[PDB]
Amino acid sequence: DIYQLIM
Amino acid sequence: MSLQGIHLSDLSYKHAILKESQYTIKRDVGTTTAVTPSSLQQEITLLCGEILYAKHADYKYAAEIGIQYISTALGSERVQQILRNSGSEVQVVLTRTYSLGKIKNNKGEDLQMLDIHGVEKSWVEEIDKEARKTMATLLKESSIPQNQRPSAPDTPIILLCVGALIFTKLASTIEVGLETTVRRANRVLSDALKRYPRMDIPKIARSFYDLFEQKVYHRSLFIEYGKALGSSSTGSKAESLFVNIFMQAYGAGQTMLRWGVIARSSNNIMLGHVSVQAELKQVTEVYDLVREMGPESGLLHLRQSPKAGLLSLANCPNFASVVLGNASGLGIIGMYRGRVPNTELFSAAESYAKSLKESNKIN
Amino acid sequence: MSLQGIHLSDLSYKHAILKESQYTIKRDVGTTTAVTPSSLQQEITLLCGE
Amino acid sequence: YPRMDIPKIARSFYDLFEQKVYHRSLFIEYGKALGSSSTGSKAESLFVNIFMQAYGAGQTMLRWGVIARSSNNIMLGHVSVQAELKQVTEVYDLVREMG
Amino acid sequence: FMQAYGAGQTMLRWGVIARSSNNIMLGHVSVQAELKQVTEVYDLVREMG
RNA sequence: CCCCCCC
RNA sequence: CCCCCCC
RNA sequence: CCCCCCC
């Protein structure tokens, strides 16, 4: 789920 | 009968020779550089924050990302105009968003990564992945305000503040520049260091020094960014900090002129020495040249303009020695490496300056 | 012979550098904010009292 | 570049400056155009520094006369020197006229 | 709002007060050596308006 | 870096 | 004739 | 050649 972070 | 007609004015003539030219130099005809349009400003700011909150293996192109943010702030075509007016024929290549691939974002669309000419996609992808992994580890460990995220609006200004600290020491040496940048950024950028406790100042500063050395026109772009930031009506605390450091960079490469003004203001009696009196005419000519050039004279050595060197006081050994002596007497000289021609004048001026500073007087 | 030509005026030069710029900084390109038209003044004043 | 042969390159440049006098003018225009650029490299700043060091070439007597006046040499007050200072002032005025 | 005016620049106001207070320690040689740049800052204020 | 009081 | 040093 | 400190 690394690319689904809010950032 | 009188020695009044014996006068030369060579420095004014050399300046008139240099400035009054009808031919422009053409350099970097076949080179290219990258800019980022203002529309991608958000997408650069986020990336500008990704270099800060994670430990990265390599920091080759952090300075290029800072310059990209400068391009977004000014505008791509305005940056073309800046580079063209700097005397360079470098051709801009335009930053482009590209889909990473099958990877999906939280909004449901394809994950769009930035494409900057001269910066390989491997470095950008690695920075993105490392920053994401650091964020995931932090969220797993503890469960992150807004000002500790890469998307904070002031992260590009923090990167550019490290860049401005390295800019202040562009007339110095690379090791001294790095050391001063680290020492000053531990204090100047202390709040940002608390927000981002793992931004590696030495490598970002090294990247900025490398960029300023390879691409001289980026010095002009940086100066124009500082000028455009100082003319804005409002701004953030980070931007005020950037303009403060930028103005601290101003008279770089000409500290001897400032120390001469100080020595005059210190009323050093050794300025009355006959050796010093024999040379003060050319010193006044150098200061008159500064007045002629005007406000842009201070940026001569920062821009690395070839015209810099007319402002040099290196043909006034008596004046330079007395000025360095007065600087040493007040303790201002520090670790200045400027050579001392006459040791007797230096020692006498140092003794008088220590006498004046140690003593007190009322006028 | 006289120390009259030793003068710098750096602060005036820094101000001239900052003010005399032909490029404007662009910030907050993608952000939005809210305003209220004058017709709703009453309807804001009441809420301002609440 | 530890094997660039300075003497022969310098000899070639002296030969070029002697045979083709107009190349002196071209060199001077290059120096003028380099000194007017906004930015440049360390090599270009070095070139303009040497070029400006070449400036008053062939007229070191005028510079040494200015130095002697600034040195307050009392022998400038000699009657033989006083009898000729008018033409010296005329030469310096000619320098001011040429610019 | 007018009380908010000179915010962030109380040192300039206190310098004007110190001059109006006729502080003799302004005549100190250390202070005299720096008054030129102080006058330049006040001139900058006059320039900005 | 700057700023920092009171009304 | 002029020029001639050093940086 | 120039530059070189500190903030």
Author numbering:
A (entry chain B): 10 to 16
B (entry chain A): 1 to 143, 146 to 365
C (entry chain A): 1 to 50
D (entry chain A): 198 to 296
E (entry chain A): 248 to 296
Share the article's original sentences:
The viral genome is encapsidated in a sheath of oligomerized copies of the nucleoprotein N, forming a ribonucleoprotein complex termed nucleocapsid. The nucleocapsid is the template for transcription and replication by L, which is also dependent on the obligate polymerase cofactor, the phosphoprotein P, together forming the active L/P holoenzyme. In oligomerized and RNA-bound N (N-RNA) the nucleic acid is threaded along an extended groove in between the NTDs and CTDs of laterally connected N protomers. An important function of the C-terminal domain of P in nsNSVs is to bind to assembled N-RNA, forming an N-RNA/P complex.
We carried out 3D reconstruction of 10-mers, 11-mers, and spiral particles of the N-RNA with PCT. In the reconstructions, additional density was visible at the periphery of the NTD of N. To facilitate easier model building and to obtain improved maps, we carried out symmetry expansion and local refinement of a dimer of N-RNA/P as before with N-RNA. P binds into a groove at the periphery of the NTD of N, between a helix and an extended loop of a beta-hairpin of N (here denoted as NβHL). We observed that the density of NβHL becomes more ordered upon P binding, indicative of a folding-upon-binding event. Lastly, viewed in the context of an N-RNA assembly, the PCT binding site is located such that P attaches to a region of the nucleocapsid that protrudes at a far radius from the helical axis.
